[PDB]
Amino acid sequence: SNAMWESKFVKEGLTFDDVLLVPAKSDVLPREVSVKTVLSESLQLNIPLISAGMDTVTEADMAIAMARQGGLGIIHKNMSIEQQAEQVDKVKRSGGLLVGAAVGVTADAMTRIDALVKASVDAIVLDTAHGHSQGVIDKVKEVRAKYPSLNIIAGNVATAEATKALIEAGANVVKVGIGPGSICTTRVVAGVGVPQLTAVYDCATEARKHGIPVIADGGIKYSGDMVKALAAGAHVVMLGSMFAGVAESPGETEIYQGRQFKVYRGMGSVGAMELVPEGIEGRVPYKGPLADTVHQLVGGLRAGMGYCGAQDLEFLRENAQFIRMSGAGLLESHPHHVQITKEAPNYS
Amino acid sequence: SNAMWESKFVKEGLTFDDVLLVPAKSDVLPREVSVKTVLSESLQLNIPLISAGMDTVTEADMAIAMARQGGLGIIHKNMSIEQQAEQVDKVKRSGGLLVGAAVGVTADAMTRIDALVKASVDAIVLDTAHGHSQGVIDKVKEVRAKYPSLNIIAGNVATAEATKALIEAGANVVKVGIGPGSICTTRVVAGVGVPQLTAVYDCATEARKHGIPVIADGGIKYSGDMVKALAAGAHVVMLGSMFAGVAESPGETEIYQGRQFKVYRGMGSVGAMELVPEGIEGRVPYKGPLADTVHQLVGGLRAGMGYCGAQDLEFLRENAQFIRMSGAGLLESHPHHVQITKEAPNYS
Amino acid sequence: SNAMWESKFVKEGLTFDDVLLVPAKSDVLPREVSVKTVLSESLQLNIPLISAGMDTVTEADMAIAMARQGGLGIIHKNMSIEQQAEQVDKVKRSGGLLVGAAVGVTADAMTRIDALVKASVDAIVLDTAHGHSQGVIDKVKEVRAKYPSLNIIAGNVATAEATKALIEAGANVVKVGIGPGSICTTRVVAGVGVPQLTAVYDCATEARKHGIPVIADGGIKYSGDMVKALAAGAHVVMLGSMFAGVAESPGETEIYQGRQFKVYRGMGSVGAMELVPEGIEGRVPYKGPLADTVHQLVGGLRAGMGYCGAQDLEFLRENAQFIRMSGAGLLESHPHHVQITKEAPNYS
Amino acid sequence: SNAMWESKFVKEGLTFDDVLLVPAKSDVLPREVSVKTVLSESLQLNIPLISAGMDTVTEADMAIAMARQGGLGIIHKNMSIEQQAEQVDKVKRSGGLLVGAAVGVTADAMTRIDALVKASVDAIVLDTAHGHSQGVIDKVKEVRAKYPSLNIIAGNVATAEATKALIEAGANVVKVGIGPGSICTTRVVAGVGVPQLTAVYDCATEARKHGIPVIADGGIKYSGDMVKALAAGAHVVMLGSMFAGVAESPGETEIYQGRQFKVYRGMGSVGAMELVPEGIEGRVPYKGPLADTVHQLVGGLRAGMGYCGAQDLEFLRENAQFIRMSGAGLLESHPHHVQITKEAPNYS
Numbered sequence A, B, C, D: 001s002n003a004m005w006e007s008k009f010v011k012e013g014l015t016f017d018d019v020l021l022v023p024a025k026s027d028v029l030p031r032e033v034s035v036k037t038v039l040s041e042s043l044q045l046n047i048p049l050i051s052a053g054m055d056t057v058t059e060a061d062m063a064i065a066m067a068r069q070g071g072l073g074i075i076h077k078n079m080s081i082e083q084q085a086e087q088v089d090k091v092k093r094s095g096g097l098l099v100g101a102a103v104g105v106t107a108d109a110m111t112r113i114d115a116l117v118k119a120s121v122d123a124i125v126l127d128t129a130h131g132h133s134q135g136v137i138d139k140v141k142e143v144r145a146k147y148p149s150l151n152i153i154a155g156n157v158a159t160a161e162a163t164k165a166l167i168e169a170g171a172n173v174v175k176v177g178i179g180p181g182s183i184c185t186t187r188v189v190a191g192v193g194v195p196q197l198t199a200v201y202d203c204a205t206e207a208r209k210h211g212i213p214v215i216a217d218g219g220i221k222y223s224g225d226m227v228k229a230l231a232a233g234a235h236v237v238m239l240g241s242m243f244a245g246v247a248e249s250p251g252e253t254e255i256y257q258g259r260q261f262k263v264y265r266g267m268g269s270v271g272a273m274e275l276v277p278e279g280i281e282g283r284v285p286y287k288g289p290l291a292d293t294v295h296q297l298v299g300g301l302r303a304g305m306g307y308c309g310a311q312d313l314e315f316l317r318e319n320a321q322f323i324r325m326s327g328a329g330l331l332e333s334h335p336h337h338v339q340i341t342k343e344a345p346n347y348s
């Protein structure tokens, strides 16, 4: 048979829980490493964390808190153009903080982008389920032509070919992830995706050739997953579930069975779209102020970089090595054969 | 040692949960794709769905509802010849809808087929546990000789060699699946089967040479599984469990623990055969009208084809690529690390 | 480094749940296949089943029932020489039924063997934890010299080298299995074993060269596992757990939580040895008369042989092919995504 | 791309639960094998067991009990220099028993070492999270220069390169393990580690070239795991969880749900450090006197060595072979398909 028929099952992919980072010679202290990342000359983050553009994760208060921590918030698009620009302006006016804003790849995308730019947004996230679509390429080209110095984050993709296409269209950051999200059912209902560590590595392999940073978006459930994503080639990670329970996320806290929870739902869930949904609606434990969660995340990254001998994220991306393991490896890696009696601040 | 001794463990097989479809360049919208499939010039389905010929899945009301949705129902064989022909006639008389009917590979198969043909059945399913048996080949040849223009669906098989044999015997559709069914214990009690995605791919590899469509029968538990089966080479899928809970299936709805359920059982279960059974008896949640389940199934397929750049199912079969993953990949692919609070229409 | 250091992790092994048997062209009916097996010219079994020589599995009543079903019982050794010979004689006097008896590889083994031979035992099982020990080889040679026509079953082993050694010592049947038993902790507490399907295949590969049959002993939990063991090269299987709950096993039935159970324990458990044990003590559901369990076991074997085109067990051993699968393959192979409402006679 | 980018995912690693030891020709009895191990000419252990230097595992009473059993206790460092030296002296004065003591790689390490040496400690454990750090190498060199005949145990490492570096710095025992510990979250929160059997094998491969013994530290949950670690190349193992519940460990016994438990926590847990912790706090069942647990551990090792034909641990390290298995292999290896009714002394 011909080539495409015979190649159907050749590829294999890895997720975070399939690997560990191999410790390496180190003369760097975790407290000393640099976790700064340059997404563009006008978009420099002191910590490599972006909060997702989801209506249960990031509005103005979250974006302010993220920026004050050194990261970035993406204001979600499930609001009027006027309100989104208002939230962007609110963040800009809170000390000149960095802020991004999500825009769908639709006919009126440019109208929303116009108002966000008037509000001095620092980056637009052209967000779509399938970034390797001809419409997304076309929209990226159109935005780049109108706003030649605007930071354009485009996604989501999971292949080198898609990454190449968005870069050549004019995106200066590519967002990587099809289906790994904690609330995501795309892989179950449509059958489509790429295991996220392989997606990041494949997309970074291409993006590196152009000097373009990639965002590892989705499926990070512990701080070590972030370290693996950055070591696989991402400049920065995007989190939904691990931020949805913090005080500054939108949505109120509820008590269920005597415990505190916040609603967290996919943007393709029935509730968010108000259909054949590609996400579910759920709840996550309340975690208190964002600063505490960021401290645990960055602390785990600093530890991981110390173990890998990485003074900065460039060294980590370029040098860190992995070792593949089985599910037995994963069970050994977590706590095991002990009844845990207290919740740790970075493990529950 | 000789060749058959040394080859015993060489082969490896994949199931739906071992793979994901890789997203590809796309300029097609899910709502625009064609999901039409031609099983023969006289058996064209607007959607690639067949309801199984099981006594808890398909009688006349189910077959009418399936046909009105653009698919096909197989009237089960656990009834007299007279009653089966009556149900076939009932469907034909409900607007000229397409209908199929199951027939066992037994001495009196031709007598039942005669009455079904008199009733203008559109296709006979020569259904047997092991389609690669000399008796099935012989029966297919005999039916083809008597009814040269009758659509003959023959199965079940799981190998290229068996597919070749049924095609050369005169079947114009081959039904693929040994043991993946949700209610099936063939693999546990007899030890025999082939992981279903590999079975579909191997059988389609052979059937493609002859221009013969294959049905992926069994083991589909989410809409994404159907997309994978079609991308592995099947023209159409056959579902039991995902249809057994709909209003139009036979059998009444029961309340258990305050929830609504319908009985669903293997045709080789003790109850259905009334023995050494190869199926079990169980229950599945009630799902309401068939149309709602079909809408979710076809919607997931449309999404998957959009992600794969497939304007029609021919493109999907011929071009779609997979990536293999571990159980960690599967857990990332489902929702994870969130308490789900609402049932989604396509995920429970 | 040298060769033994570098080869430490090269080998890989398969268990029953790692594979399926591939269906093949068949013109044989399950009810027509032969499941007869010749362990020696004086030890011919109409069904390929031996009940384990364990003190919760086989005494005289079990051995009588097994022989009447066409199989073989091994009278366990946890009794005086006088009592064991008495139980052997009881079986012989119940219609000339076949019977075996277990003997440990100890200084006084020959004394026990002498009384069992006087009682017309048909086969001695020289049973030990580690059959590849110099003492076992020596004892096999000694018994063969004294009793040149006695059927000697020797074990347990899991390698071709050990199989070769026991055959050359004079065993005419080799018993295969280190650690797969349902009640066995050898692999957990000593770290030692070979996944049982690979153990059977490796040992049969060697034994075939000499014309010597092997017994697949341990780890069979469904009838399909027996089919896989025989297809991997074993002439016959030995079962403990699947026989321990039948009426004819020794030990009384107990009610726990309103359900009927029988005690089943490893012969290396604290209770059986009355220490550092290599087995545990447990309970299994009561199953009623042996005949019902044997009917389900042989029925599953007949189905499996029909699927494989095997008119007899020689054809199965010599021709049957496997396909390797993942844990996802295993979950597809069992019933899934259905609430089971009734216990099947061959699946619980 | 360049070499380090392309090698990121090449390596694969094994844990204890990924393998079994293959039985081999044996003429040795478990009760006859030697389990003595020479860590240095002045540090000879009659059994290959060290209790971890953790504040819920080893103080003076544990170290006395370990030494009387033929092993070694490491007095933990979570106490003043004066108190640690006092506990070392207490052990030395209980019959000249061997004792070790943990020291962090800090500026004042030498001051603590000075007091421990004045107290006649037999070995210092230079304990750190990441032994492949330039500071650890430097500290090992400094201690070796001041105390040329002191036994220096240095760790923890997981690579041949790190092992080489610590040996060349002057450590005469290397401690191996990054993240396998039962209470450890390093792999989850920092993303870093090596599956422990591969870590031991890789480190032993290097250490063998220099004649240097390695300690397999962490992740042993059954006695068979210890046998695998020693067969992979370690001279001795270090246990935390399997010793934390014994009478002689520090910390009092608590009743929870009518059962007896002792606290067991990581030394990098919030509680032990009193932060971004790399361990959790939990509890383990109370096990009674240390001697009973040691008897079960050494008994399992003796059984494993008998199965492998190893008269002593040198033979085991140099000759024992493994076979790799799936998770299905693991489930077959444990007890299965039986309800366990009594706790075994070596299996719960």
Ligand SMILES: N/C=N\c1c(C(=O)O)ncn1[C@@H]1O[C@H](COP(=O)(O)O)[C@@H](O)[C@H]1O
Binding pocket: A052, A053, A054, A156, A177, A179, A180, A181, A182, A183, A184, A185, A186, A217, A218, A219, A220, A238, A239, A240, A241, A242, A265, A266, A267, A268, A269, A278, A279, A280
């Ligand atoms: N279509 C799959 N996923 C969705 C859905 C949905 O399905 O409805 N809505 C958001 N996403 C993705 O999920 C990430 C969060 O992932 P998380 O950090 O929680 O693991 C987000 O940043 C998105 O990339």
Ligand SMILES: N/C=N\c1c(C(=O)O)ncn1[C@@H]1O[C@H](COP(=O)(O)O)[C@@H](O)[C@H]1O
Binding pocket: B052, B053, B054, B156, B177, B179, B180, B181, B182, B183, B184, B185, B186, B217, B218, B219, B220, B238, B239, B240, B241, B242, B265, B266, B267, B268, B269, B278, B279, B280
């Ligand atoms: N012998 C294995 N399976 C049986 C049994 C049984 O065992 O008794 N009765 C039906 N089947 C198969 O199962 C499919 C449904 O599969 P499903 O869509 O529920 O996953 C059906 O279309 C049949 O191919």
Ligand SMILES: N/C=N\c1c(C(=O)O)ncn1[C@@H]1O[C@H](COP(=O)(O)O)[C@@H](O)[C@H]1O
Binding pocket: C052, C053, C054, C156, C177, C179, C180, C181, C182, C183, C184, C185, C186, C217, C218, C219, C220, C238, C239, C240, C241, C242, C265, C266, C267, C268, C269, C278, C279, C280
């Ligand atoms: N040392 C490992 N196993 C033991 C133990 C024990 O551990 O104490 N006592 C019996 N055995 C083996 O187990 C088979 C039954 O296996 P089953 O049919 O229940 O899966 C028996 O035929 C024996 O080969």
Ligand SMILES: N/C=N\c1c(C(=O)O)ncn1[C@@H]1O[C@H](COP(=O)(O)O)[C@@H](O)[C@H]1O
Binding pocket: D052, D053, D054, D156, D177, D179, D180, D181, D182, D183, D184, D185, D186, D217, D218, D219, D220, D238, D239, D240, D241, D242, D265, D266, D267, D268, D269, D278, D279, D280
């Ligand atoms: N950083 C990972 N682990 C820790 C932690 C912690 O995380 O806080 N504290 C101790 N360790 C290691 O764990 C072994 C015990 O392992 P065990 O015998 O219980 O499996 C010890 O000997 C240490 O090597």
Ligand SMILES: [K+]
Binding pocket: A332, A333, A334, A335, A336, D179, D180, D181, D182, D183, D184, D185
């Ligand atoms: K761990």
Ligand SMILES: [K+]
Binding pocket: A179, A180, A181, A182, A183, A184, A185, B332, B333, B334, B335, B336
């Ligand atoms: K997901």
Ligand SMILES: [K+]
Binding pocket: B179, B180, B181, B182, B183, B184, B185, C332, C333, C334, C335, C336
């Ligand atoms: K099944």
Ligand SMILES: [K+]
Binding pocket: C179, C180, C181, C182, C183, C184, C185, D332, D333, D334, D335, D336
């Ligand atoms: K076992």
